[model samples]
Target: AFVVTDNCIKCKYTDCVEVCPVDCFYEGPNFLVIHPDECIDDALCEPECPAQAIFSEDEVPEDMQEFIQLNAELAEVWPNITEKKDPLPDAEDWDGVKGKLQHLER
Candidate 1:
């Protein structure tokens, strides 16, 4: 399964959502997560992420590893988002900004 990491916190770009073959992404106020169960793992969503925030389970960065489980947990609750809506208003400003886990909205 692919995971959405902390880099996606404020960016919230939906390109990954558009590319997900299983329609497995879930949306929060400032983040998006991929439901592990629904992810087919065809490796489609990873590259579509503008923030480069999506990663394969084993390839996920060590520091962002918690998001592997976070995606599963949050997907169970956040509304499913399947369309490519405009990213957050300040998405560019937030891209590449680290330590964004602190700003992750539920």
Candidate 2:
């Protein structure tokens, strides 16, 4: 399965969600995560991420500890990302995205 990594902490551009053929990604309060069960592993959405935050689950580094749990947790509550044309109201700001990395502590 594909995974969302640390680069996505607060830099969720969500273009990734826009292009997912299976629409298997889920939104969270602070990040976007992929549902491992639902993902076809087409990897279509991986390159679409401006943050380059998406990766194959097995490729995620050990330092990215929270991402493993994060992907799973988001699946429990996130709306099906492809259901809507636009993102949720609280979606991250593209302009403010770069700054988030500074404040997005684990």
Candidate 3:
């Protein structure tokens, strides 16, 4: 399994969704999540993300480890979104930003 990390908080570039074989990415207010159970570990979405926000569960950044939990928990509630959409306004400005964890939308 892989995880959607802090970098994706406000910079939800969903090009990754287009390449997901299982279509496991779920949509949220300002982010996206990969359902741990449905993810086939294809790793397609990992490189497809412009923000480089997706990571293998074991490779996730230490500070962003909580994202693994968030992905699993949020996917349980957020609707699974297969149709990709544009990112938030100013997404680039937030790219690689720190402390995005505080801004993750429920």
Candidate 4:
């Protein structure tokens, strides 16, 4: 399964949502998550994320937190990726992007 990290906050480029084969990725008010059960781990969406927010669970940092469950649980209730089809609203207007997040830097 794939995971969306905290770097996604305020940088929810819907490109990942658009390309998902299963529509497994979900969007929240502030971020996005990928449904663990629904993801085929095709990794098709990872490169599409402008913020580079998606990753496999094993590579995630410990302090960044709750990514696996975020993908599984939050994805279950968050807006389905299929329901929305617009490039992230005002993507160019964000304050700053986490840009290739590496946990220790935070």
Candidate 5:
């Protein structure tokens, strides 16, 4: 399994969604989540994300470990989204930002 981390909060780049073979990414207000059960570990979405927000579950940093749980929890509730879409208005500005968990939207 993989995790969607804080870097995705306001960036919301859909590149990951476009490459996902399982179509496991889900849409939230200002972010996306990967379904823990649905992800086939295809590894396509990991590099496709410009924000570098996707990480393997075991490789996730200690501070970002919570996102693994968050992705699993949110995927069950959010609507599935597969197609690529324009990123958020300030996606470039938000890119590389740290500690964005506080800004994650439902």
Candidate 6:
């Protein structure tokens, strides 16, 4: 399965969601997450992310491993978001920023 990481915290670009064949993405206030059970490991969404925030679970960076669990937890409650949409107001500014966990809006 693919996991959305900290890089998506504020960027929240829907490009990833648009390409996910399984429609596994879920929307949050300032981010998006992937549904583990729904993901087909198709690897289609990873390169579509402008924020470069999506990664395969095994290839996810050590520091970003928490996102795997976060994605799973949040996908249970957040609404599904399959279509492309405008990103957050400051998405560009936040795109490459690190330590964005503090900025994540649940």
The window of 10 residues in a row where model 5 has the poorest summed lDDT is: 13-22
Off by more than 4 A, model 2: 83-106
Pitting candidate 1 against candidate 2, the one with the higher TM-score is 1
Q: In candidate 2, what are the lDDT values of residues 1-106, reduced to their tens digit?
A: 8888866665556788777877788876556788888889888888887667788888776766557777887787776666433443544554334434344432
Model 3, position 42, has a per-residue lDDT of: 78
Q: Give the better candidate number (1 or 4) by lDDT.
A: 1
CA lDDT scores, all candidates in order: 0.91, 0.70, 0.89, 0.70, 0.91, 0.91
Model 5: runs farther than 4 Å from truth?
A: none
C-alpha TM-scores of all predictions: 0.97, 0.73, 0.96, 0.75, 0.97, 0.97
What is the overall TM-score of model 6 with all chains considered together? 0.97
lDDT tens per residue, model 6, 47-78: 99999999999999999888989999999999
Off by over 4 Å in 4: 83-106
What pairs collide in candidate 1?
A: none
Candidate numbers sorted by TM-score from highest down: 1, 5, 6, 3, 4, 2
What's model 6's overall lDDT?
A: 0.91
- Model 1 whole-model lDDT (C-alpha atoms): 0.91
| Candidate 6, pairs of clashing residues | none
The regions of model 6 sitting more than 4 angstroms off are none
